[PDB]
Amino acid sequence: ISASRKLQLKTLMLQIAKQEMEREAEERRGEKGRVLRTRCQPLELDGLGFEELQDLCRQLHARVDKVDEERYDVEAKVTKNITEIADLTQKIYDLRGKFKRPTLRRVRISADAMMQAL
Amino acid sequence: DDIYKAAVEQLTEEQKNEFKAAFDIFVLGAEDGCISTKELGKVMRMLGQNPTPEELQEMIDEVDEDGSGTVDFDEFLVMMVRCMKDDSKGKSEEELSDLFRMFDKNADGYIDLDELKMMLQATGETITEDDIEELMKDGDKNNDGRIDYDEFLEFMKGVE
Amino acid sequence: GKRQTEREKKKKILAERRKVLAIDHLNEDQLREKAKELWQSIYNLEAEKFDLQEKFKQQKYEINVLRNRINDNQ
Amino acid sequence: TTALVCDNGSGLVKAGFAGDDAPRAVFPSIVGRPRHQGVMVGMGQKDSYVGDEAQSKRGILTLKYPIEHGIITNWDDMEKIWHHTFYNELRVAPEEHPTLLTEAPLNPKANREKMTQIMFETFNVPAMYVAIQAVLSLYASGRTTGIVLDSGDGVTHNVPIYEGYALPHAIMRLDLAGRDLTDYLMKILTERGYSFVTTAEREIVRDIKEKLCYVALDFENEMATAASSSSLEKSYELPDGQVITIGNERFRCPETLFQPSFIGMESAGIHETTYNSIMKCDIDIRKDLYANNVLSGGTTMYPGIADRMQKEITALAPSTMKIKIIAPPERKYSVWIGGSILASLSTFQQMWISKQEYDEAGPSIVHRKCF
Amino acid sequence: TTALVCDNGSGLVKAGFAGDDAPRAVFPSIVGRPRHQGVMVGMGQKDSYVGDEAQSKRGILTLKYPIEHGIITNWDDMEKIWHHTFYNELRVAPEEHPTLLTEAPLNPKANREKMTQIMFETFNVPAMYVAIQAVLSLYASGRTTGIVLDSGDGVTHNVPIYEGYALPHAIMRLDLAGRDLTDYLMKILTERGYSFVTTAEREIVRDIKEKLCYVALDFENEMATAASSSSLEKSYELPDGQVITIGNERFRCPETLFQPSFIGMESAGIHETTYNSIMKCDIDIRKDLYANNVLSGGTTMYPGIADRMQKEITALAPSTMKIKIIAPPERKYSVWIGGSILASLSTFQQMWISKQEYDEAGPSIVHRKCF
Numbered sequence A: 001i002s003a004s005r006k007l008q009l010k011t012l013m014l015q016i017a018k019q020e021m022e023r024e025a026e027e028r029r030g031e032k033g034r035v036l037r038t039r040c041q042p043l044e045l046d047g048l049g050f051e052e053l054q055d056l057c058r059q060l061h062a063r064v065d066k067v068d069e070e071r072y073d074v075e076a077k078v079t080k081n082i083t084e085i086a087d088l089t090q091k092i093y094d095l096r097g098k099f100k101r102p103t104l105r106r107v108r109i110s111a112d113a114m115m116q117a118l
Numbered sequence B: 001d002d003i004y005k006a007a008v009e010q011l012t013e014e015q016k017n018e019f020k021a022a023f024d025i026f027v028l029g030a031e032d033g034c035i036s037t038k039e040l041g042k043v044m045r046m047l048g049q050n051p052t053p054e055e056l057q058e059m060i061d062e063v064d065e066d067g068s069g070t071v072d073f074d075e076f077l078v079m080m081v082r083c084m085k086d087d088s089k090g091k092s093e094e095e096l097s098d099l100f101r102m103f104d105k106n107a108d109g110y111i112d113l114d115e116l117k118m119m120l121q122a123t124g125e126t127i128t129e130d131d132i133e134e135l136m137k138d139g140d141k142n143n144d145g146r147i148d149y150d151e152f153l154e155f156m157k158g159v160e
Numbered sequence C: 001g002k003r004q005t006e007r008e009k010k011k012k013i014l015a016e017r018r019k020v021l022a023i024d025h026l027n028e029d030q031l032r033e034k035a036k037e038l039w040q041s042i043y044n045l046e047a048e049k050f051d052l053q054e055k056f057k058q059q060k061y062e063i064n065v066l067r068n069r070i071n072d073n074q
Numbered sequence D, E: 001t002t003a004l005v006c007d008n009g010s011g012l013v014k015a016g017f018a019g020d021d022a023p024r025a026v027f028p029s030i031v032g033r034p035r036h037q038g039v040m041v042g043m044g045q046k047d048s049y050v051g052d053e054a055q056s057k058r059g060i061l062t063l064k065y066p067i068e069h070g071i072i073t074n075w076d077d078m079e080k081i082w083h084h085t086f087y088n089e090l091r092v093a094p095e096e097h098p099t100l101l102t103e104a105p106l107n108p109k110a111n112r113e114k115m116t117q118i119m120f121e122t123f124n125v126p127a128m129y130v131a132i133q134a135v136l137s138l139y140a141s142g143r144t145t146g147i148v149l150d151s152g153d154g155v156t157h158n159v160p161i162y163e164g165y166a167l168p169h170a171i172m173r174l175d176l177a178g179r180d181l182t183d184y185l186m187k188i189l190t191e192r193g194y195s196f197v198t199t200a201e202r203e204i205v206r207d208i209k210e211k212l213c214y215v216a217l218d219f220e221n222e223m224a225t226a227a228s229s230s231s232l233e234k235s236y237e238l239p240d241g242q243v244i245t246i247g248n249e250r251f252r253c254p255e256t257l258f259q260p261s262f263i264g265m266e267s268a269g270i271h272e273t274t275y276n277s278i279m280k281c282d283i284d285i286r287k288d289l290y291a292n293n294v295l296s297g298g299t300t301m302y303p304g305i306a307d308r309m310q311k312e313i314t315a316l317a318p319s320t321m322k323i324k325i326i327a328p329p330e331r332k333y334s335v336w337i338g339g340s341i342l343a344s345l346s347t348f349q350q351m352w353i354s355k356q357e358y359d360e361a362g363p364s365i366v367h368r369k370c371f
């Protein structure tokens, strides 16, 4: 068919894909918010003696430091993920740089205007 | 008219007036405004930004194919939007990556023609044997059993 | 890879993340305020770690994609 | 700030700021003292006209190139040329700009050390780096492999490179270049009656060579054709009239490249030193070098050389390999474009020879890690 | 979870998940540092290309195998090979998968102990087990008796087994294998003019050996025929052209297996060490071993070896016994297929060397009950 027709249909497909991606992103944002709400438990501190609430808070503090440890674990893992991402990007870029080395430059800066000064 | 009026606004009514003045400059003039047909070649000679031969072929297909002897104002602005740079910059590499990842629901590291058909039909566009098969001939250049990553990454280069 | 070094780094960071506060120097309303503050802090912790997991999933998918494409090279 | 990508060359000095497409100022590298007496008083006559100014007053000067074959033989004149290049053709003081000179392969060390000493003491640049003239020409082509034949005006050298790893044992440097072709053309023009002797008339012979000469696809057939018909005789108007007609001198001048026995040189032509340079390489990268043969330098601009060279190499090489000769239209400035690209890189930004380093190790720093 | 059936080998590392038919990733085990200087900046040049990547850039590398004869001589390179195998060819972290290495018979203890120490400390696997390379090849044939001749690329060993009871006093390990045949072929090619010296050209000679050489049914008749006619001369195209013609070098290279006196080795050929290995067995299981002779390993893929070996053994053996040579078409991966079958068994699931056991007894656990 005509190239313009195929291009337009491709454009429509890409726009629809972007719309679906944005809707799924909204869904994931709301779902993450709600699930994070589920992870955190409600606190009812009314009518609590000093010892009772103090123990509760100390338990919360211990759990907080546990969360710190788990976040350190997942952060080390995510740093590994970022490192291997950089390595993959480097290798792919090298494979493309078998034929794309001088692609980074700027040409025709200021000389193309200077023509008749001589 | 959606794509057509989008192109119209690409060279908006200000650009429309600018090109109307330019047309009055290069047109035959001193006439009834019957509007010639060679004026699209006259502007090609005049502005210096000569439309590509592909644009001239599009003009011949769209106009003068029936011996009109004139180019319609809508078709004239169609040709004008075919000459000025209303580029879409081919989106971005990350945006293409996201769109292809969503096309690769199977997470196969490439797109299948079944994936192509499903993504196209999720848009509601009539995807018949005139499509996919033509896209096998056209959309997929390699046709090496699937749509490889560079195949569709480079396929959507400089497109909307 | 020198898991002694990694554990040392873990100890340093956890000591940074270490937070120990007064527990017997506040009244009931102050105690409840501190409990609520800790709840909100660890709630931010939950949200951030959910972000960490989700971004890790996305990164892992991209790693799969890049590995697949570099295997499609040959 | 921006870097100055100078390129001394031998015959044309090409310079300009890093990151552009073409050199800003290109002018012959000649310094000519006046030779007659001079009777007008107060005319404002200088003692040495350099650069493009001495190509307009060449009627009463004695032009002399300060660079013979890559190497520099007259350091005062070269310093004068550099001073002119910095101050009058670019108008940027060197105190605020890094410089990236270029040097032919296999040149004497003392030349390079003196070059860096001058750049650091007289002009007092912040940091300078010296690069081999062939790696840049490989940059400009956007490749990363290939064997580049950079036939300049001083010296023709042939550096093979694979995957970014240069092969130092396969560099074949030959000293036949554009200047020897100019001298040989000036010597064979005497067979028709035209005698050019003065160092100023060498420029006229150079113009004749540039505008008329071409490389024949097959030498014997052209020699036979030019000796029977007269379809080749092209005429040319001297700077004063008296047009001249060049017959079979047209393709005999640049033929010296493929048969250096014409000017008495023993070595083999540029068609066979490339094949020898390839054969010294390892057995597994010869296909890639065959397929990515790169031409550069001014003298490779003769009309019809990219076909003669391909025919010759295809004759020499095994029949299965594909021989391809990359001849970009921007051949003359290929080295400088590559120099601009290299100077514009972020990864390269820490390879400059910083001035404090020179102060600690002396001019011999250039041979060290900062190459 | 699933088990990782790795198989170090010597020449080709074969790996894949347990329970499949063929290894997932097969690639040469070579680690080659670059040897030239390298002039392109920012090309992303690594310091060591391992596996199949160094078989494409071998023109500028110095490939060196980390496993000489079964034993491992360079532990850092072997660790690099394992790391590549786990992370890039299979993309499965070893923290969640048992491993089943393979080892030749009669190898030094320190090699095996270091192997298990690496697998438990660096890669930190849950549990690993080391198995003799011949028992697996017997698994893959679906037998339970038979004497298996596993002529790999590093070392040729001949383990007889009856009814599942291995005979430790009848294992005959000989160090002639594919690598020595490659070296001998490279040494006899010089008799026609072709000289291969570089460690990269050893790969080319290996390809010649794989594609052209064959084992002669009768050696003297072939030597006489190749010296009169010219029906044997097969040509082959090098990686750059210049085809070569192999004459009676075709069947002289693999003949070294049956006459190890060619490369100066004293011992008897693979046709007579099998008979000697049988004769050391008891008098009542010799018929079964005669009838179930199994071939395995890469080097036993020469066209026409399953007939030469049968003829030789029939000459040696008593006339009444039937001599049968099992030569499955999937010979090369026979060891790995057997490894997959063994790792997929339920009865075997409690033989792994669990990590807590290693923590209690140290690396010397491998010689203990968990063999």
Ligand SMILES: Nc1ncnc2c1ncn2[C@@H]1O[C@H](COP(=O)(O)OP(=O)(O)O)[C@@H](O)[C@H]1O
Pocket: D008, D009, D010, D011, D012, D013, D151, D152, D153, D154, D178, D179, D182, D206, D209, D210, D211, D297, D298, D299, D301, D302, D332
């Ligand atoms: N268009 C041309 N045709 C033929 N020869 C040329 C042409 N342009 C330049 N040359 C020759 O090349 C020389 C210039 O070479 P160039 O590349 O400037 O040398 P360098 O490497 O020193 O810069 C001139 O001396 C001239 O003889």
Ligand SMILES: Nc1ncnc2c1ncn2[C@@H]1O[C@H](COP(=O)(O)OP(=O)(O)O)[C@@H](O)[C@H]1O
Pocket: E008, E009, E010, E011, E012, E013, E151, E152, E153, E154, E178, E179, E182, E206, E209, E210, E211, E297, E298, E299, E301, E302, E332
């Ligand atoms: N088709 C073949 N024909 C002849 N020889 C082969 C063939 N395939 C492999 N070989 C030889 O066998 C070797 C591979 O043996 P292999 O079984 O991989 O050893 P390992 O036991 O270390 O895995 C190669 O070095 C090669 O010399």
Ligand SMILES: [Mg+2]
Pocket: D009, D010, D133, D150, D152, D153, D297, D298, D335
């Ligand atoms: Mg040059």
Ligand SMILES: [Mg+2]
Pocket: E009, E010, E133, E150, E152, E153, E297, E298, E335
């Ligand atoms: Mg084996």
